[model samples]
Every structure is written in structure tokens, then in C-alpha cells.
Target: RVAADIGAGLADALTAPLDHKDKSLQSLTLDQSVRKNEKLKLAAQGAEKTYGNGDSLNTGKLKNDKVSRFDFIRQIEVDGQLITLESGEFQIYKQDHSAVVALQIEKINNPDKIDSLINQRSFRVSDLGGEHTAFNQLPSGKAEYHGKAFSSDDPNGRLHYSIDFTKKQGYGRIEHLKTPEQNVELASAELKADEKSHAVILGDTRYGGEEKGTYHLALFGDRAQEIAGSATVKIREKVHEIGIAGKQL
Candidate 1:
């Protein structure tokens, strides 16, 4: 439970009251969606694992049976002091005059700056036991910055992450609806089969039509830092396949 302890400690430290001014709370709106073809900017997202057997540890609050899903709002307050637990989704967890297991925190930079230009914030969270994330509606609403992370109930040292995105160019305009196929425009593709240390090729891409400029296509998994367990994938067989106008091997 040292990983739990570390997370608690970090939470307590982060929860410590700060001397900042109140924010408008304007950015915390639920009207969060993006424009066509424009993908969400991945400001910051990551994962972790901790094994304290030899020397180290790693770990947060609970939310929907998960850990700190809304860690950002922990910094925001109503009056001049920290927002108490019952008021929000978090509580400064204390166990034996030591640490906190649940609370809110900020990343302190531009990546974290997608929401507001305030000193503190407004939001909520609980222990994820494992974790996941949410998006930041930048410029108030037009564009959105989305993200998320998840784990295996987190009883031990296992880890993983997922992908994200949306589209919003800096203006306060209407996000026109686009068909799923009309959004992303693929330009070109490249495949290096010579080295063969390992090589991969995609079939029936959504945007199969050719376009001007050079564009290469690759693959990513549904999880973070890994796809197909990030293991070296081997194609056992791809026999029956249809043909498209480029060429067939």
C-alpha cells in the first residue's frame, strides 16, 4: 500500500492551501465538443507503476470506483479557502497523522492552462484505485482539449493509457457538424518492408482517396505507451484480401 501512501502524500502536499485569487469558473462548462477534422490537442497525459520491494513506490482519490478523475478542480475554491470535501468530490485523506489519499491538484503550466487564466480552479474527484482523465474546453468553448487514462483496478503494479482529441481553431464560432468520414483528410502513405526488423501496413483506411502533399500512415493502440500490449506483433496470416487501385503484393 506504499503506492497508495505516496499518492496520499502527494495529494496532501498539493491540497495545501495556496494564496491565489478567485477565478470566474467560466471554463468549467459542460458544453464541450470540437469542430470537424480538428483534433483535440493532447496537452498532457501519462501513466505510472510502482514496486516498493527493492526501493520505490508510486500512486490518489476515488471517483466512480476509480482514482482522481478530476484532479484539476481540487485547486479551485469558493471563498478564499480550500473547498472542503463534502462540498466537492474529494477529501483530504488522513491516516495516522501522515498523508492524504484523495484531493485535487494542478499541473502549473500551459498544458494545464487550457481551462482558465486564473490562479486556482473549480472542480471535483475521488480515488480511481486506477485512473482516467477528462478534457479541457479551451477558449471557453469553441475548441476542446481532451484526454483520459485507465488501470486494472490497480491492486498492484500494472499500467496502461488511451488516446484522445477534438478540433477547435482559436475563434468563438460554431463547430459545424461533419460526417465521421468527412473529418480527417489523409494525404499519403509510406511502407518500409526492406529492413523487415518488423513492418506494418494498414488496409482500408477511412480516407483512402489520395491527396496532395506527403502523408504517412501508422498504427496506434487503444492503450497508452502500448498497442497489442506493445509487444512485437507478427502477422500469422493475411490471405484473403480485396484489392484497391494502387497495387497488390
Candidate 2:
């Protein structure tokens, strides 16, 4: 009887967590759909997995499950009007002990600026994983420095950058967005397919489209670094303190 009870308890212990996780994910998906962010549902289903490895005797047994999804929404309150800028999905998975993912910003108005923002040097790096800011200088006709600082664009673009790095692995990409077809491509000569630390420029003068519009970019590559997971944990802790689920983790 004691052995049977132990086995039942272990089964409950394993299955309960997974059941709760599934419910939580379902709840999150419902919330997103109500908020009009259902793109992640499909991506999440595709990326989810189940694994088990153990013995029924001395070692007991173990099982694991995981899934990742991302969504981006842009809204505005201009004189009491709301606007959704862009939304999409991505698949997150593990390859060779590293997190590999792909994003698709389905509908972007002007994809070129999306490419530029990632490569630009002056974009704001939100300390607490909040919104990033980009500043542009306007010409003011000064002797030494001839420009005034002004916000070049309002609601210029929206980005949903997500990653998974539970282990000592890296995440990488070569393009920015996959669907809705943005012609931007990562410069292969600038970014080697194997190197870990590097950058690539996307837009060129010929293909540049609008003055200020939301764009989508996708990355295709591999990474092997600890920064992705560590940064994610930090962001999660901050959001938890503030009472906001950071990444649905």
C-alpha cells in the first residue's frame, strides 16, 4: 500500500505541474485573443514538445514539457483613438542545447525602418525591459553642432523581441520578419553564419520606402551565449515585482 501511494503521488506530482502549465497557457491564449493577440496560439502549438527519461525503480522517472510564443501590438490614443500597429508570431525551440527561434511580423506598413532600427546605434536600451526609444537630431543651424533634438516619429514602430535561454546557450537570427514578405535581408558579408558576436545592416537607399512607418524584420542564425537567458531572468524578476508576467514563463 505504501509503495502504491508513493507511485500515485509521484504521478500526481509530475502530471499536476504539466496540467497547471497547460491551463495557464490556455488562459494566456484566451486573454491574448480577447485583446486581439491570437497569433501566438498557432506558434505555441507548433513549438511545444514533451520528453521523458527515467526508470520506474530506484531512479524514479522524469518528464519535461516546454513551449514559447510571442506577440506584438501597437496602440495609440490620439484624441481618443486606438490603433494597432502590427502583430505576429514566432517558434522557439532548442537545438544542440541552444535556443533557436524565428519571428514573423505578419503585417508591417513599411518594413525598411524595422531593419534600420535594429542596426542603429542610438536606440534606447530599456533598462527594465520596457519600450525602446529612438531619437533623431533636427537641423538648428548652429556653428559647432547644427541640429536640434526632436522625436523623429511617434509610434514609429513596434517590436516584440523574445528569446529562450534556460541553459548556457545562445539565440540568433539573420532576418527580422518572415511573413507578409519584407524584402530586407541580412548582409551575409557583414555577419558570418557561424560567428557569435556580430551585426548586420538590412536596408539600402534603393529600397527605402516611407519616412516613418512600422516595419517587420526577421533573423535567421544560431547563437551560443549566456546573455539571452540571463537577461530574460532579470526582466522576469523586474516584471514579477511590478506584477506583470514578463514572458509567460
Candidate 3:
């Protein structure tokens, strides 16, 4: 029944294409784990929904699914001009391993007003979504950024985010492996949207250990399909910086 929603050709795209050479580690991992973890599959489904409602709608490819899932791709050379679906929708031509969604597409299309839409809608961290990059102060006291870019799955910790646009407030939490005992709480703050950068800043995060930090996130696709941001928190007088990315669920 779900296959009928996107037509046969698009649904077939969901199946692993024979071309495995271009597959990303993230996509391969997803193929192996989707059966075991229903939620990851759900995350992918939610990603498709966002893409369908926004990207596909803009292209006039597939109309509103209203309540459907699995709706996007990379490049489908239908006629002569190739339309690039630049978002994280997995396709045979793409090597991006992350199952992250397509807020990037939205930001690309609407550079100026993307911020306004972010402030108008409510969003939460994808159920099992996690951080992208992380910076840690080494034993030598040298801080460095060492984490995957655009990666939404963090095995060490799970991220929780809640944003209420109507109330202009947001909340977040991260249970990290660095200090499992002390799950950090990203302090709440009023939402502030940057008109030009397609970004939103939520400052004044009180991470249980300290009362300071910030979540500086940028909108990815149209209508806020996903969010990627850099966050900082101080614990025990040591600063931990991380990159965060997630899709709507």
C-alpha cells in the first residue's frame, strides 16, 4: 500500500539498487539495521515525508501525500535537464551515508525567509537522532573538532530537542558517553531567527554543570526540513563543543 503512494518507479528506488559501489556507509548500515530497529526506519520515513511535502511539492513532481512517507531522490534524468535533489534523500548516485533529511534544500531555495518559517513551526529532535561533530579538550589541553560531518546517529548518546515556535522557546538534552552520569540539559531560551542566514540562535543554555552555552542552528530545507547546529557547554569548568543535526519526525 505504501508503495502505491509514490508510484512504482519511486518506490523501487527505495529498494537497494544493484549499484553498491556508490553506497555510503550510513546507507549500508541502514540496510542492515532497518529490520532490527523499527525507529530508524521510521526516521527515514519521516525524512521522506518532509521531502515530499516541501521539495517534491516545489518541483511539482508528486503532489501532496498529505499523510504519506518515502518521497525524494537525488538526480532523476527524466527529460534532458537533470534536476538535482540536493537533500539527504538516498539515491544510487549519492555517496552521502547519513540518513539525514533535507533542510539544506529548503535553505538553498529560500535564503532570505527560511528563518521566518523556522520560528513559525514547532520541531523536536528526531527520536533517535544525535550529534554531527564534537570537539574535545585533549590531555594536552588542545581542543580539536573530531566527529563525522552531517551524521545524525550518535552511538554514545541520544539527543532530545523540543521547540515551541508559538511560545518562542526551546529545550534540549543529551546523554553522552563522555560523562554518562551527568546527562546534560541544554538550558531553555527564547528563539531568535536570523533573517539573512536562515539560522536560529538559542542562547543561555544551562548544562546542569554550568549555566552557559548556546545552540546556533541553521535551517536546511524548505519549511525547516532539518536542522544542523553547533552547540557548546561547560562541564566541570571544561568546555565541550559539538555539532548537532536532525530531521523532523
Query: Sorted on TM-score, highest at the top, how do the candidates line up?
Result: 3, 2, 1
Greater lDDT among 1 and 3 belongs to 3
Model 1, CA-based lDDT: 0.20
lDDT of 2 by residue, 11-117 (tens): 33223333333221111112222233212222121232211111011011111112133343333333353433344543222211122233334554234443221
Task: Write model 1 residue lDDT over 127-236, tens digit each, in one string.
Answer: 11111111221112221211111111211211121122222111111011132222222221232222322222222222334321221111121111111110111112
**CA lDDT, candidate 1, residue 27:** 12
Better of 1 and 2 by lDDT: 2
Cand. 3 TM to true fold? 0.37
Candidate 2 has its poorest 10 consecutive residues by lDDT at: 143-152
Of the candidates shown, which would achieve the greatest TM-score relative to the real structure?
3
User: Each model's TM-score?
Assistant: 0.16, 0.21, 0.37
TM-score of 1: 0.16
Residue 41 of model 1: what lDDT? Answer: 19
Over 4 Å off, model 2: 1-67, 70-72, 93-102, 109-249
Candidate 3 lDDT, 1-249, residue by residue in tens:
552344332333334333444322122122221222122212233233222211111111221211113322223233453433222322111112123222211211123532222222111122111112111210221111122122122223445566555555656665554554234565666555454433353655564466656656543333334444555556666555544544455
Candidate 3 ranges with C-alpha deviation above 4 Å: 1-155, 195-197
Top-lDDT candidate index: 3
